[PDB]
Amino acid sequence: FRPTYGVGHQPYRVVVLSFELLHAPATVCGPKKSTNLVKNKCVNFNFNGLTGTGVLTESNKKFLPFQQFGRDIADTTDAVRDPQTLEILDITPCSFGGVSVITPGTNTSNQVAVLYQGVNCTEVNVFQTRAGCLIGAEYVNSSYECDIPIGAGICASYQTQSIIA
């Protein structure tokens, strides 16, 4: 090898990689892919393989240094530690529930009020009740013999021109 030599005789350095895959307790895997964490919002998370959905909140439980996951009764994953900062986070599924329609009758009027049962009005006039968030009806202090039962001691009826709870 000397510099006057043409291309066909110029020393090419070559390196060949052979990946074996038989019985593989694979000890080499280096893909990065780690995005910044988001809290207090319904987010899909994948913590070191654990996939789920829910709202993340700062934890108050004492994880032992060798523990990585937390579960309540019936295998519900309640908490997880970050594989990056090792901070404990609480998982609670964000609010969901059934919705019901309050109607005074097609033949009286077409107005309608909607009752979201398992929710607070902050994450849906508007009114809050122990039975859920009620929309479309105004709360009055007068007590009457009630005819449309909503729940938790609250009822609704046609004012006569509005629906009152």
Ligand X SMILES: CC(=O)N[C@@H]1[C@@H](O)[C@H](O)[C@@H](CO)O[C@H]1O
| Residues 6+ positions from 116 with CB-CB distance below 8 Å | 97, 99, 124, 132, 133, 134, 135
Residue 141 near ligand X by CB under 6 A: yes
Q: Which of 63, 98, 94, 99 is nearest to 80 (CA)?
A: 63
Q: Which part of the chain contacts another protein (CB under 8 A), choosing from 2-10, 132-140, 145-153?
A: 145-153
> Is residue 21 at the binding interface for another protein, with CB under 8 A as the rule?
no
Q: Is 60 in the site for another protein (CB under 8 A)?
A: no
CA-based nearest residue to 150, from 126, 130, 136, 120: 130
CB 163 within 8 A of CB 102: yes
Residues that bind ligand X (CB under 6 A): 107, 120, 122, 128, 141
Site residues (vs another protein, CB under 8 A): 13, 15, 23, 25, 27-38, 41-48, 51, 53, 61-64, 66-71, 73-75, 79, 82-84, 94-108, 112, 115-116, 123, 147-150
